[PDB]
Design a protein around this ligand. Sequence first.
Ligand SMILES: *Cc1c(COP(=O)(O)O)cnc(C)c1O
Ligand SMILES: *Cc1c(COP(=O)(O)O)cnc(C)c1O
Lengths: 416, 417
Amino acid sequence: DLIEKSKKHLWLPFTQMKDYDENPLIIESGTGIKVKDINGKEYYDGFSSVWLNVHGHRKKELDDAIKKQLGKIAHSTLLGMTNVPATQLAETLIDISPKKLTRVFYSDSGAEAMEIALKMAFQYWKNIGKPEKQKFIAMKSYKAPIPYVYRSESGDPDECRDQCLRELAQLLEEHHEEIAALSIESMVQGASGMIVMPEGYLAGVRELCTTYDVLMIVDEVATGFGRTGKMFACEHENVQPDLMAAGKGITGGYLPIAVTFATEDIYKAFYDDYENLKTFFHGHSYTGNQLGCAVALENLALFESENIVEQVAEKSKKLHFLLQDLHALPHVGDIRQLGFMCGAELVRSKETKEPYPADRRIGYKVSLKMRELGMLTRPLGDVIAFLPPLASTAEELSEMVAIMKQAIHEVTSLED
Amino acid sequence: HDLIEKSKKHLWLPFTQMKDYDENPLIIESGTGIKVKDINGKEYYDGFSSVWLNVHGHRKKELDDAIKKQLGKIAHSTLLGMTNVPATQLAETLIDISPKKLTRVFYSDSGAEAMEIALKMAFQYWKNIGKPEKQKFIAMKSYKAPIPYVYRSESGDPDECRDQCLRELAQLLEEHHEEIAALSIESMVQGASGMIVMPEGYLAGVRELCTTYDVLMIVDEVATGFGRTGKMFACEHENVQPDLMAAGKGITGGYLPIAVTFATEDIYKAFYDDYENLKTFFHGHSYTGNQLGCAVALENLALFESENIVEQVAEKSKKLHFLLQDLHALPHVGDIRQLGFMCGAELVRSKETKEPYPADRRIGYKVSLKMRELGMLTRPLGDVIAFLPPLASTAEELSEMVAIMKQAIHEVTSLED
Ligand SMILES: *Cc1c(COP(=O)(O)O)cnc(C)c1O
Ligand SMILES: *Cc1c(COP(=O)(O)O)cnc(C)c1O
């Protein structure tokens, strides 16, 4: 009856509370890559608690890092001063980030880190006397398209790539003098349905931004910290962001810490005598929280000593083969994967690739079937996301993929 | 030495000119009670409660234990489409201690996120119920409307100031309410603007006008929340019932980032419907309802109960007032403002010009640096020296911090004429 109480006082993020009331779920504990509910039923953490859990739950080293920091101080401010763990973590993050990035600006969430990146971009140009550069390009302000090869007319990766790059170039051509920055997810569009960008695409946008003197903001909130088989996904194409947002996996999934990385050139445009009004007057009260910073330092220590990134890249090879036989199912239209970042797009006809009408709630229905079959994930429309913890074993991966295959079949054959 | 050099090499600090940090850096290593200790071993009174969030002091044993216990279960699992135990229990406790009309808890990571969520809730509320014209908001200082600043008003009278500002609000609402979704206001004290305490009856007046003109009242309790003004929430001072209320900072006793937007049932129910009907509030964050933060918040609220912090703040605030009135007598202290443990001393170049020092003399900053050498941290708000001591501060500690502040103020300010 914590259950009937839950229905009374909560308002959950991104969720229709009527859906919640009809199918409540309350998690009590976790161990390894499984979480347990208040009835004792276990589930594989098939989405890494929304793309942030790295080493599974109750990871000893992580538990210990927080316990240790408690023994010193939980929180002191970064407003006008600093603390030991935030400073140490800043140096460590800079060691592993793309080389052009030299500064760490903390915040609480990935959304905050992105918002800061945009404000930085905007004020940067104003600070250096170019107040005309105030517009933004959001790749899906002006908007420019990212390749969606699966639903393209050519079905051709680099045709699609080149055509999208041509359209961005046109946008850049006639408005660059007015544009402060372009924002883009690194390599994989998450919320859009785990859409992996064709080779050379991200590199191409970097090139255009440099050419037309526009700051490139790269969102690594989902992709960062090993998720795609590289520490940061922009390593796949050797891209150097001007500003880079990270969060989620940074703390191994334990606590809210997020970061906006900037280059030295951006930082110095705000560095001056106070009187000169160059200061970046933004931030948050919990910025650089010791508890969160302490757990992130140990998270990173583990990446190094557990060779997590190599292990992810290795395991991703067999994972691909498991997924392709998933492709065989009558309603699996497309399989998309980069590292442990995967999605299975569901469709009513794989020949015409016509989707189900949204009102058949296929994605939701699959997620519920997987739930009863003992696995958590979150659907994106009718794309079944699969983002297993980075510590997942080959065995655990094959078990999670099997549950996906069964749920998809059991649901979609009724067409639900 | 190299910690200090590394600090200058890779950090970009919030709300701070890094050149200022570079010439006077400060790195904190630990905390005990209401004191923090830097890496050189120098100790400082936490005069601003680590920027208005520290409640019981640092390394509060019960707080530490609460987090260790929760670690033994699970650190984080999602509230996206499901929930967890600590977040569920905390929500019930929060509803019990919050204004009665507020029945729903929507978690986020920060006070800013919780205010952003309140705005989006209000906007979509009106659209959901078929009045999409209600798309603007009022921000008290979107239309802006003025809050009473009694100290440098014509009359210097609270009632007169209150009544005038309410008259301006009423006219704005009379003329534009059909286009307005919500009004946003800090509860009783404007913090960042200089710890400006609202005159008696003003907040209630705002609530009445909002109700009268069908505008949702968003009350920001991020600074005032959790005992800071000598009530659990500041809107208790005038018995006001917000439509939406933002809370953060002190919620966890100052340990961890968790935040809440409270809503009424009428608001909640406008988003509750068959999914196909498109009433859903599609916003939120990945760390919403984080177990570690919710666990420490539950123990924070337990300690509020078992030590009645709120009554103690209200009691100690009486003597604090006397100590501040003493400060008020210094040549360059123009005004003293206080509600509970939420205080500011406004510094002026002339007491009955109340002419401020030119901003470029950096008086507030200079005073804050002098307090630092004197063993006490705070942050100035322009030339207002904020004083927001942890709620657990003793009468003796309160007198000690006020004395450092007094000394710092005359020491700096006597050299500026
Ligand atoms: C602290 C504060 C905020 C912002 O909260 P953050 O956690 O720093 O993002 C909002 N409103 C008021 C009144 C505050 O004091
Ligand atoms: C998670 C996510 C965000 C937002 O992060 P929050 O912590 O939920 O605010 C931003 N960008 C991307 C790519 C994300 O995956």
